[PDB]
PDB file of C-alpha atoms in Angstrom:
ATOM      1  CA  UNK A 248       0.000   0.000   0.000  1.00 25.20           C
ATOM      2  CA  UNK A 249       2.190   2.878  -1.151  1.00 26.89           C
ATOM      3  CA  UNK A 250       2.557   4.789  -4.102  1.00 25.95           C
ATOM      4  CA  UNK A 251       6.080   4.601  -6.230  1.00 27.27           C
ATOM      5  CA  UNK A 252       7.335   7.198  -8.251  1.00 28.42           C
ATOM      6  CA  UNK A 253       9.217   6.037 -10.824  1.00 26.70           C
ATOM      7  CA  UNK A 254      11.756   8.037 -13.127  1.00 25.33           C
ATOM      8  CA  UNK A 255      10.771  11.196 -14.944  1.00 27.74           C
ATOM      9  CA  UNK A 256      12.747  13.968 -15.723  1.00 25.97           C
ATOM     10  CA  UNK A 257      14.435  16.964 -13.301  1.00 29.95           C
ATOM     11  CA  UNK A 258      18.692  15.087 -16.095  1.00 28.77           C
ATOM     12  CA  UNK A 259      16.334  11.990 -17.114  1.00 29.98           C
ATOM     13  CA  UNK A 260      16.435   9.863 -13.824  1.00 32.78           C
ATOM     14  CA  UNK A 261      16.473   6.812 -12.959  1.00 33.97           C
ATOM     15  CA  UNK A 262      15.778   6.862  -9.217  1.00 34.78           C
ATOM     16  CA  UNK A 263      12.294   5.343  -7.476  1.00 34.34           C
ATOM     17  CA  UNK A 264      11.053   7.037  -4.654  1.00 32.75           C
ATOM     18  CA  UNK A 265       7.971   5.213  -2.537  1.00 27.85           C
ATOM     19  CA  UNK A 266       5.320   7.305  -0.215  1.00 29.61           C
ATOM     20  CA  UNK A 267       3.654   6.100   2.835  1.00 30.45           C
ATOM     21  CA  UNK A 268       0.440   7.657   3.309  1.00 29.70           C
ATOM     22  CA  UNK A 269       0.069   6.819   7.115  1.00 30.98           C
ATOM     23  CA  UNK A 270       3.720   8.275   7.702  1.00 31.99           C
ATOM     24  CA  UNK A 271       3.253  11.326   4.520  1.00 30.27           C
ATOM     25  CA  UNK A 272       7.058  10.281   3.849  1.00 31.30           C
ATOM     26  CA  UNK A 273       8.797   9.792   0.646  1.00 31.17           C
ATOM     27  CA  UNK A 274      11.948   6.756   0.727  1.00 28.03           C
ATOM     28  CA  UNK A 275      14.111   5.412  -1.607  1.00 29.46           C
ATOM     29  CA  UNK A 276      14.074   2.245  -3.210  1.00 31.20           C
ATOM     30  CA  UNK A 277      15.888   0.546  -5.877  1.00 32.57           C
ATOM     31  CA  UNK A 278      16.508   2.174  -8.464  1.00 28.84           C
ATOM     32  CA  UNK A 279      16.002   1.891 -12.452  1.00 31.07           C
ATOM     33  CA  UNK A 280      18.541  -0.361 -14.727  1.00 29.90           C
ATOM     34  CA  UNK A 281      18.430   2.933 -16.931  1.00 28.88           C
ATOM     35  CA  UNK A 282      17.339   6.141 -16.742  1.00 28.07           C
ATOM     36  CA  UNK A 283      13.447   6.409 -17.909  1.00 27.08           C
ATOM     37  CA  UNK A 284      11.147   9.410 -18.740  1.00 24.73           C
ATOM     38  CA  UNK A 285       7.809   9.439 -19.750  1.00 25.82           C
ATOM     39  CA  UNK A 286       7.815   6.583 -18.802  1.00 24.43           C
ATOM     40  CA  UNK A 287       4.677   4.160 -18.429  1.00 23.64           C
ATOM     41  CA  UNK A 288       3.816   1.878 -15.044  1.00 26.00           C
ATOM     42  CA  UNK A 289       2.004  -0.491 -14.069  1.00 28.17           C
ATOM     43  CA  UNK A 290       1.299  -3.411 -10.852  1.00 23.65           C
ATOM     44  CA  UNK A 291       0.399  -6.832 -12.164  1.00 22.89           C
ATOM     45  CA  UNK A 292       0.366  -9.952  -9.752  1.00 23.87           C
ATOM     46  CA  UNK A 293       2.269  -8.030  -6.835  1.00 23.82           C
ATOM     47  CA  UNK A 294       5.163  -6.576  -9.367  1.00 25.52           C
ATOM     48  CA  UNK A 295       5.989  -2.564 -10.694  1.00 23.41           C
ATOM     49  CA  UNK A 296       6.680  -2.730 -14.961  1.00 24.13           C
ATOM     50  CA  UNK A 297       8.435  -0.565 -16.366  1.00 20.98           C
ATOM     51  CA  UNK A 298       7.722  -0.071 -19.580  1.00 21.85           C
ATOM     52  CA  UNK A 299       9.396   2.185 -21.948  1.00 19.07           C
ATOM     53  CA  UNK A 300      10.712   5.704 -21.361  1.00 17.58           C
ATOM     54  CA  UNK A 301      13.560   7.759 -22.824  1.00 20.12           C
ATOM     55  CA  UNK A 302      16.841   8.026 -21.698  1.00 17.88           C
ATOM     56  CA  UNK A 303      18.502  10.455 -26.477  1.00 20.31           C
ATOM     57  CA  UNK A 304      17.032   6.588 -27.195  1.00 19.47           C
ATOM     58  CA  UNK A 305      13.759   6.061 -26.863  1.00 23.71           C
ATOM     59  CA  UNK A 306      13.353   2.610 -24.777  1.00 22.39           C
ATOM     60  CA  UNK A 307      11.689  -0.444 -25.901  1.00 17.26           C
ATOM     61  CA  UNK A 308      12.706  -2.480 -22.637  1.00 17.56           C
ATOM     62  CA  UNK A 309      10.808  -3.136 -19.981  1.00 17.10           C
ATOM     63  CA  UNK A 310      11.971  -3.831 -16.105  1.00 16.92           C
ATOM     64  CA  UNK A 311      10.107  -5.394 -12.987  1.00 13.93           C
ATOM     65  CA  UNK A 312      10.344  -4.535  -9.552  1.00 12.18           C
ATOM     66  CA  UNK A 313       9.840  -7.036  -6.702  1.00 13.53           C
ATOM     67  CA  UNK A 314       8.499  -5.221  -3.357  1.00 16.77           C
ATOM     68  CA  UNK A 315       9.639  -7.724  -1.082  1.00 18.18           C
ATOM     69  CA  UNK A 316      13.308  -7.864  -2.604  1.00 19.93           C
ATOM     70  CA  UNK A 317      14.176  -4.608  -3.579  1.00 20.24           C
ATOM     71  CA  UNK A 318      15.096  -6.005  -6.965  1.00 24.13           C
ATOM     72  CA  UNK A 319      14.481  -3.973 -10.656  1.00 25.94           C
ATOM     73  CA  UNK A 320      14.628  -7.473 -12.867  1.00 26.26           C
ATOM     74  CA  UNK A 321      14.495  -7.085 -16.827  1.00 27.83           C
ATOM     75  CA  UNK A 322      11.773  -8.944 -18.888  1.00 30.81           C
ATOM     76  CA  UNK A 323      10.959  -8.825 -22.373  1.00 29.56           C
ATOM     77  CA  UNK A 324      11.594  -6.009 -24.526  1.00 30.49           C
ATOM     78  CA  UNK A 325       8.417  -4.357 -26.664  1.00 33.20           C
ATOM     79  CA  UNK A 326       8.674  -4.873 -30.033  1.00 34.09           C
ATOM     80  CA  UNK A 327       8.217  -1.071 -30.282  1.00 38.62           C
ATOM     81  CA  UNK A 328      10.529   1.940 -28.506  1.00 37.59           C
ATOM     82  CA  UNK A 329       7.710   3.807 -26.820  1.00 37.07           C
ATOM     83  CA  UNK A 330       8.197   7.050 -24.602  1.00 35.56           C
ATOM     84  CA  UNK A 331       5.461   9.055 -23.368  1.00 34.45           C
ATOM     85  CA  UNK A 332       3.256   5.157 -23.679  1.00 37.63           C
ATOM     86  CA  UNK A 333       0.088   4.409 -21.546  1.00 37.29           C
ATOM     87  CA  UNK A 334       0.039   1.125 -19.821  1.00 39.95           C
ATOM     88  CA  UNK A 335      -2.245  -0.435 -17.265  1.00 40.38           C
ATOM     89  CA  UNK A 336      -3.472  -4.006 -16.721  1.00 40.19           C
ATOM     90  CA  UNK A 337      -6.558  -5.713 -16.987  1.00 45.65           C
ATOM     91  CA  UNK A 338      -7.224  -9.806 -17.087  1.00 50.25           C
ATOM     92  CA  UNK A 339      -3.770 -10.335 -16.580  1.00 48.99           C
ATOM     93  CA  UNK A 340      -2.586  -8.340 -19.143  1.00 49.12           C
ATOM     94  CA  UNK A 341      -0.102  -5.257 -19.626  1.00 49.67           C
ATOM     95  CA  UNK A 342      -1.208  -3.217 -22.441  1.00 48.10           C
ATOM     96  CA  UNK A 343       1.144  -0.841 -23.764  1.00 49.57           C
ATOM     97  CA  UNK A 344      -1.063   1.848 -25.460  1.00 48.96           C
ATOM     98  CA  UNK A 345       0.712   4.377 -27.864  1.00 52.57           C
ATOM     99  CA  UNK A 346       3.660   6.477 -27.294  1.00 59.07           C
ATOM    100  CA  UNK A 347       6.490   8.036 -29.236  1.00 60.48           C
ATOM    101  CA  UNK A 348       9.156   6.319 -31.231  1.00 58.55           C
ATOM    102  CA  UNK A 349       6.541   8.976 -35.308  1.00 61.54           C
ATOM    103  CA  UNK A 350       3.809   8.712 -32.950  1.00 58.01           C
ATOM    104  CA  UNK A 351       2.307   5.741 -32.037  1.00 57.24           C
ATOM    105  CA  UNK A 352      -1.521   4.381 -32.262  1.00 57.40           C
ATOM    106  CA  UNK A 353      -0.164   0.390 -32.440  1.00 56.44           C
ATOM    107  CA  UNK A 354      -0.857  -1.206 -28.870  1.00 56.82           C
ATOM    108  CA  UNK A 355       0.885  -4.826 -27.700  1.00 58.03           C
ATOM    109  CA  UNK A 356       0.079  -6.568 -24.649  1.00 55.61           C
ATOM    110  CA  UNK A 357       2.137  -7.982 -22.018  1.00 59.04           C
ATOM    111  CA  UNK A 358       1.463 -11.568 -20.694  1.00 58.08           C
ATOM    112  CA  UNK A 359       3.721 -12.377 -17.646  1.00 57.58           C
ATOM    113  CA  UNK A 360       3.512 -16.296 -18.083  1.00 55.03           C
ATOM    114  CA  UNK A 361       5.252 -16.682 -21.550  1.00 54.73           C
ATOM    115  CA  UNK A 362       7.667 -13.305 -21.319  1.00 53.56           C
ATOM    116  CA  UNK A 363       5.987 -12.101 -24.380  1.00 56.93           C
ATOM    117  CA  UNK A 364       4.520  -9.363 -26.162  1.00 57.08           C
ATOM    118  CA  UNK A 365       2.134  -9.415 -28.500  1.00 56.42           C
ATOM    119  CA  UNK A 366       0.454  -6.679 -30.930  1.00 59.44           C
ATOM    120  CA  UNK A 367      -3.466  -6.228 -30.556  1.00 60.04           C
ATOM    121  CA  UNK A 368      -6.118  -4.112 -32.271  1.00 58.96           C
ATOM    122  CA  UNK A 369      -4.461  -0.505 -32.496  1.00 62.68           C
ATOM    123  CA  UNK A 370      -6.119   2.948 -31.806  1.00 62.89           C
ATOM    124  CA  UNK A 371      -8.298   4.926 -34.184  1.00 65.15           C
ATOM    125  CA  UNK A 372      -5.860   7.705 -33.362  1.00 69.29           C
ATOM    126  CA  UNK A 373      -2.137   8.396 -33.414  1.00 67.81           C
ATOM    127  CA  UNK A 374      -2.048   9.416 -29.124  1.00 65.81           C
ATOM    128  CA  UNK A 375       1.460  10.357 -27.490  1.00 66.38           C
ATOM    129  CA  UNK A 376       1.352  11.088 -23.453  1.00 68.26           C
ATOM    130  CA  UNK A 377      -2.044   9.620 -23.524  1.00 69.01           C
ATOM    131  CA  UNK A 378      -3.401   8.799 -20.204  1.00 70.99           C
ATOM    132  CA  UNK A 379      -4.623   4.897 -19.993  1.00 70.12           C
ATOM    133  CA  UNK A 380      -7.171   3.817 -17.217  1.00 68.05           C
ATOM    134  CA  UNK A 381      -9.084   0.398 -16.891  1.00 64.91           C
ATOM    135  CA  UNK A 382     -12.650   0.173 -15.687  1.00 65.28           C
ATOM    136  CA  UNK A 383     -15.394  -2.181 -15.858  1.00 65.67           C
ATOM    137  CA  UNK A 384     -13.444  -4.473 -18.117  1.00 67.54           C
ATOM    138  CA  UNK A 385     -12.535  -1.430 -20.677  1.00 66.14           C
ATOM    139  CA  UNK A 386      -9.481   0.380 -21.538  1.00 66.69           C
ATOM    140  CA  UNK A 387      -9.552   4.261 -21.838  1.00 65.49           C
ATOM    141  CA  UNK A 388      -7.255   6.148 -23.999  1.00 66.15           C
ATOM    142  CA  UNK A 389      -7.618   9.458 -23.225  1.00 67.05           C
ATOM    143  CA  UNK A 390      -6.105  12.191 -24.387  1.00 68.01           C
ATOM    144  CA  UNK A 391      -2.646  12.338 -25.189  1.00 68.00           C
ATOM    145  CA  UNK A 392      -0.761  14.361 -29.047  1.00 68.39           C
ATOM    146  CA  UNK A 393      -1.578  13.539 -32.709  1.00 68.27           C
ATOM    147  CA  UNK A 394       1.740  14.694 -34.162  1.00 67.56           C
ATOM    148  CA  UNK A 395      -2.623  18.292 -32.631  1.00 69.70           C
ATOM    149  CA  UNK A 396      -3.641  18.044 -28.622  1.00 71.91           C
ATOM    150  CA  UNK A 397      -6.410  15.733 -28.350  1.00 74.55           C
ATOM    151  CA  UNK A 398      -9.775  15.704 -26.510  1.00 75.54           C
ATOM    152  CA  UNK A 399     -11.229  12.500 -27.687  1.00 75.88           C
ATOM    153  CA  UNK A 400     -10.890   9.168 -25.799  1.00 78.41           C
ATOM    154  CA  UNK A 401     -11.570   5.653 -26.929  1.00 77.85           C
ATOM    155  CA  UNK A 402     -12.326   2.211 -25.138  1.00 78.94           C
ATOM    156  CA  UNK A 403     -10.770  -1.040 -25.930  1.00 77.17           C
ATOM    157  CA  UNK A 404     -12.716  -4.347 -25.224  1.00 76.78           C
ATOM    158  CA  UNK A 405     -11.090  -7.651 -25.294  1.00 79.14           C
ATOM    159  CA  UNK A 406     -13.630  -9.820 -25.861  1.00 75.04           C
ATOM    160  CA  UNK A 407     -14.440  -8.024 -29.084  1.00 77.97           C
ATOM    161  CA  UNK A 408     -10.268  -6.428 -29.442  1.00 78.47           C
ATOM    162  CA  UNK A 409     -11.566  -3.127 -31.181  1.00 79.82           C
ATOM    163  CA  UNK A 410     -11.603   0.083 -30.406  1.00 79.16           C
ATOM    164  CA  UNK A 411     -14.512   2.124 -29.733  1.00 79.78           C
ATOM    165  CA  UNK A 412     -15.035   6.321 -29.127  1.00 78.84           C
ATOM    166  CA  UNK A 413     -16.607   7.524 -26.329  1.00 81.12           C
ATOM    167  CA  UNK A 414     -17.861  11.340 -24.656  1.00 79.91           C
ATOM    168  CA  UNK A 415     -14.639  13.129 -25.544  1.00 79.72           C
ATOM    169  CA  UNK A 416     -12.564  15.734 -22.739  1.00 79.56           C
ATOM    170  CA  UNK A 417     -13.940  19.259 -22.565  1.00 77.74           C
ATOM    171  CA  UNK A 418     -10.356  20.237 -22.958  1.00 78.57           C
ATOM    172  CA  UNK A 419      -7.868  18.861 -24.657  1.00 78.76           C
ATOM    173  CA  UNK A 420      -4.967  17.018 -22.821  1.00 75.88           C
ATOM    174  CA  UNK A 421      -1.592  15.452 -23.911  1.00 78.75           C
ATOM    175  CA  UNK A 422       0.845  14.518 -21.052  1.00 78.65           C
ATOM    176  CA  UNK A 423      -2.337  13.918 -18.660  1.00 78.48           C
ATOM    177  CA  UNK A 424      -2.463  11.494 -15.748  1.00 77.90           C
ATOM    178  CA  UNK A 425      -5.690   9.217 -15.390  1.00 79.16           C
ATOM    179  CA  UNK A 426      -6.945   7.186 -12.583  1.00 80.70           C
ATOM    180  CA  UNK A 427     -10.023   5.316 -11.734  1.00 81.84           C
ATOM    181  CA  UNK A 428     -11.872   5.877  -7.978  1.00 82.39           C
ATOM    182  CA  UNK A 429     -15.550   4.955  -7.092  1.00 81.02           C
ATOM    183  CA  UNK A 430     -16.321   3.764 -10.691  1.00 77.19           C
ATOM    184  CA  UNK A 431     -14.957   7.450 -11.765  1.00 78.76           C
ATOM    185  CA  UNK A 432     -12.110   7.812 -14.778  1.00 75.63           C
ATOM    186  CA  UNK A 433     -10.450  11.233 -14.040  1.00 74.97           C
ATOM    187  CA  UNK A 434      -7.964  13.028 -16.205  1.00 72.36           C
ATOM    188  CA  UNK A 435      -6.109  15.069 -14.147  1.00 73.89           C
ATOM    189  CA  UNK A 436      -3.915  18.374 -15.621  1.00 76.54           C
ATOM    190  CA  UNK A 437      -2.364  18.037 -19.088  1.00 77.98           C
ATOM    191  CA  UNK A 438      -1.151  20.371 -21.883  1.00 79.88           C
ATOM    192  CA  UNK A 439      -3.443  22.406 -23.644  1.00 79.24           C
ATOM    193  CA  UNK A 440      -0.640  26.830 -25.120  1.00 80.17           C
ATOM    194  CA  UNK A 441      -1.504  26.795 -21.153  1.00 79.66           C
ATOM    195  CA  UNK A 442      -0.192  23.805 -18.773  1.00 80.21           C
ATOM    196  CA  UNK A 443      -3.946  22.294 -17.462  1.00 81.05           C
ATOM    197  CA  UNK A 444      -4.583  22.681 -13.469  1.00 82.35           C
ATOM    198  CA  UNK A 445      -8.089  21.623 -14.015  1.00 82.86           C
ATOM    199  CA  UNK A 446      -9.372  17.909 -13.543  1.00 82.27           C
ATOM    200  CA  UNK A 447     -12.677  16.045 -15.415  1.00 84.30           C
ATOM    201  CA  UNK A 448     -14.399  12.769 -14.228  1.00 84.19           C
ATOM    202  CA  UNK A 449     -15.814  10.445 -16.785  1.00 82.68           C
ATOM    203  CA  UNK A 450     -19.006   8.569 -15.639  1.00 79.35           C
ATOM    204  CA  UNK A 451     -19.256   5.210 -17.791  1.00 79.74           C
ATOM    205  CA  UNK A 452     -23.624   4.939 -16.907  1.00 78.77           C
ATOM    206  CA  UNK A 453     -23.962   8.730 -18.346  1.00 79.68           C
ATOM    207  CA  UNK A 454     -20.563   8.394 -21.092  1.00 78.22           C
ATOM    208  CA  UNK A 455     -20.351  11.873 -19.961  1.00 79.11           C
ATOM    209  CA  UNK A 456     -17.506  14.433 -18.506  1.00 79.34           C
ATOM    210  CA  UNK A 457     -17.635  16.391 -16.027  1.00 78.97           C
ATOM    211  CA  UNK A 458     -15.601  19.196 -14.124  1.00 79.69           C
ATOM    212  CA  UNK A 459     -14.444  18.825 -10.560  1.00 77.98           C
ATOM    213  CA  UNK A 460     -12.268  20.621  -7.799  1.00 79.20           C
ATOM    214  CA  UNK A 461      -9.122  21.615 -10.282  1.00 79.99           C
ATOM    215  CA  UNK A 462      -5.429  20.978  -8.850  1.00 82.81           C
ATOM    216  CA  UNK A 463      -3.681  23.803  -6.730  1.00 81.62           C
ATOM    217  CA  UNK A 464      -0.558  24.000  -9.100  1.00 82.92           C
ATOM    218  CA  UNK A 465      -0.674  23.266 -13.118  1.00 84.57           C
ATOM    219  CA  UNK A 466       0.570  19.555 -13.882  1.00 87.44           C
ATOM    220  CA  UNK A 467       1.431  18.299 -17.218  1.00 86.68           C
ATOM    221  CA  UNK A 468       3.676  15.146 -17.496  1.00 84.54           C
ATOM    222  CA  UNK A 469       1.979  14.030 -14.085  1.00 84.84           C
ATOM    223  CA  UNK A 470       1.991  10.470 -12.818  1.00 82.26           C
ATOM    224  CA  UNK A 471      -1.392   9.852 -10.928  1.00 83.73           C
ATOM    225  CA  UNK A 472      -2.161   6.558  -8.787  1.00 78.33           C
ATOM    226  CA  UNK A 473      -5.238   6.115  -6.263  1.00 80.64           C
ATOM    227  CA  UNK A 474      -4.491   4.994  -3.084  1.00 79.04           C
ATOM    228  CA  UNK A 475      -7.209   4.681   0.077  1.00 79.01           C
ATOM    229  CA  UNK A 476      -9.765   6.527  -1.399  1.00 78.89           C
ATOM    230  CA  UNK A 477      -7.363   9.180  -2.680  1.00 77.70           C
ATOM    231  CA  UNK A 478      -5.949  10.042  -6.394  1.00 78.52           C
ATOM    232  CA  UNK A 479      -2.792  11.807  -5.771  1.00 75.69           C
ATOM    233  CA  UNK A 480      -1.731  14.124  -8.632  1.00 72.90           C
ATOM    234  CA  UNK A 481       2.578  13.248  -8.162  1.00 72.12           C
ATOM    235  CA  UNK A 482       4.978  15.751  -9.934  1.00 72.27           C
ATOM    236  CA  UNK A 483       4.649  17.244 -13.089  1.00 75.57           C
ATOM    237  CA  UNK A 484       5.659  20.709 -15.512  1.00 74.15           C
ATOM    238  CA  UNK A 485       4.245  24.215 -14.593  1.00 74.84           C
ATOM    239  CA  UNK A 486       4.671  25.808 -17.451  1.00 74.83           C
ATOM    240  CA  UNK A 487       9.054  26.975 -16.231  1.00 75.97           C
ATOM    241  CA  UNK A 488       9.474  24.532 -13.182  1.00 76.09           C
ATOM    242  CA  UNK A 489       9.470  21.095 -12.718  1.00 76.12           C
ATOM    243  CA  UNK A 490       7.271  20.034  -9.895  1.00 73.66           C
ATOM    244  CA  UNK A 491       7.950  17.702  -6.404  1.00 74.26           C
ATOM    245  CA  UNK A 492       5.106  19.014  -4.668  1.00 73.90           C
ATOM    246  CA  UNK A 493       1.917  16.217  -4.564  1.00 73.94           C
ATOM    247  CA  UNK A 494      -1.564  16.655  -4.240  1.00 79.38           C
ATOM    248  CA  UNK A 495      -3.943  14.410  -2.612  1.00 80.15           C
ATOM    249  CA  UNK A 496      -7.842  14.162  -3.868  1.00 81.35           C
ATOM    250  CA  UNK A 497     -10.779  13.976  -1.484  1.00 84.49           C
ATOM    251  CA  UNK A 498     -13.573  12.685  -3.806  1.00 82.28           C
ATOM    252  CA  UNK A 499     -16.009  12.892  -0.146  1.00 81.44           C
ATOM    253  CA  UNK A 500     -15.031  16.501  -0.302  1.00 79.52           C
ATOM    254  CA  UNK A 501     -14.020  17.398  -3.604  1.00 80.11           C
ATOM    255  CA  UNK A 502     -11.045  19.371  -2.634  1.00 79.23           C
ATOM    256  CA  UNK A 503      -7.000  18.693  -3.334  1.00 78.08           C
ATOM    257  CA  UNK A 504      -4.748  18.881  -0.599  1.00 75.17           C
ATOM    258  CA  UNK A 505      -0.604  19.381  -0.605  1.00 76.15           C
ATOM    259  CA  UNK A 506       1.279  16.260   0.721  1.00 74.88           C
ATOM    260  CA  UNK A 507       4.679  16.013   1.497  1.00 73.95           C
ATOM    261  CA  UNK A 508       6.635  16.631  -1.494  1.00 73.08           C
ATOM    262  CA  UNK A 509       9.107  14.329  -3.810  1.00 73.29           C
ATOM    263  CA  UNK A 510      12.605  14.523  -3.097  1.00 73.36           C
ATOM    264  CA  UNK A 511      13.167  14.834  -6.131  1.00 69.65           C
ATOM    265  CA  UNK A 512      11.706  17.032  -8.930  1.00 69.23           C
ATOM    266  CA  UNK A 513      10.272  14.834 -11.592  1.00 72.95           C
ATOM    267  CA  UNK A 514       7.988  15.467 -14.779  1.00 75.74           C
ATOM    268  CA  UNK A 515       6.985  12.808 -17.059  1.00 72.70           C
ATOM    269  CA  UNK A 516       6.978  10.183 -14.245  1.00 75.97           C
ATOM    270  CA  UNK A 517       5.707   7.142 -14.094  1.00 74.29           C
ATOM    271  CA  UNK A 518       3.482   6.426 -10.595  1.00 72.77           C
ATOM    272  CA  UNK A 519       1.647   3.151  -9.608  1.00 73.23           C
ATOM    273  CA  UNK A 520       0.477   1.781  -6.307  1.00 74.01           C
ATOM    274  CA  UNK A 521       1.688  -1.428  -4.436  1.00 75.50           C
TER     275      UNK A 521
END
């Protein structure tokens, strides 16, 4: 139950720094084989993937990291260099949505028993620093730069492996965090130019968005994760300085809140929960 923060960008880094929420304390862990930012993560059967980043070369590998050991282990490679990719997890799969290499709309998927990725349907739209959430079996692409800043956002399904658009953003977003809470997909900051403090909720029963509290500080290239009823908006770009400071989301109250801050300042980060 803590939130990792994994690379970004102050010098592209390669450090991982973990939060406690009871304590509202950043640590240390292990850090990165190589230096990663923009960087995509995800938690699949009690393990942090890496996937991607740029260190310049834009990455195709892909590293775990074991909780309990303190370990960053490499697994297999994509079969695309993707920086500024979407990943997140659903059926026991990794799906590495989009990204930069040209920019991506090809998307492969990760599965942990054979070491192996493999290409699936791609997106109806080329989407770089596209935010990816999962809910209710579905895979949101949302967001993210057709190199244009986009608003629209598509599903995935499995079962069916096509593609599917739904109730686009109010404002376009590229470099926007995403996170699911209560049955709620929010897109939090982004790059519209003017860096994006505000924050929209998507609510699958009405495929409709909708505007809540916005963040404190303006956040694109922010890592989001949700943690005990919380989404906490980790790091980011004010467009300029690069942010440490971290917000924490009441949904009860619909207000953000400062936490203690990264020790170091990182933009384009990759943040999970484990």
């Amino acid at each position: 139950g803590l939130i990792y923060a994994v690379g970004g960008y102050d010098t592209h880094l390669n450090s991982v720094e973990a939060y406690d929420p009871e304590r509202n304390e950043w640590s240390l862990v292990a850090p990165l084989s190589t230096r990663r930012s923009g960087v995509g993560v995800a938690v699949l059967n009690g393990l942090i993937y890496a996937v991607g980043g740029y260190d310049g070369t834009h990455l195709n590998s892909v590293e775990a990291y074991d909780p309990e050991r303190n370990e960053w282990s490499l697994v297999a490679p994509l079969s695309t260099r993707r920086s500024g990719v979407g990943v997140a997890v659903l059926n026991g799969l990794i799906y590495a949505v989009g990204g930069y290499d040209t920019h991506l709309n090809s998307v492969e998927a990760y599965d942990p028993e054979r070491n192996e990725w493999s290409l699936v349907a791609p997106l109806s739209t080329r989407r770089s620093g596209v935010g990816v959430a999962v809910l209710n079996g579905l895979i949101y692409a949302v967001g993210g730069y057709d190199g244009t800043h986009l608003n629209s956002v598509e599903a995935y399904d499995p079962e069916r492996n096509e593609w599917s658009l739904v109730a686009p953003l109010s404002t376009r977003r590229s470099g926007v965090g995403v996170a699911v809470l209560n049955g709620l997909i929010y897109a939090v900051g982004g790059y519209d130019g003017t860096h994006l403090n505000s924050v929209e909720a998507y609510d699958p029963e009405r495929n409709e968005w909708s505007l809540v509290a916005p963040l404190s500080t303006r956040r694109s290239g922010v890592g989001v994760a949700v943690l005990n009823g919380l989404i906490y908006a980790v790091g980011g770009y004010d467009g300029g300085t690069h942010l440490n400071s971290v917000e924490a989301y009441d949904p009860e109250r619909n207000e953000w809140s400062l936490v203690a801050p990264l020790s170091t300042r990182r933009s384009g980060v990759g943040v999970a929960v484990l």
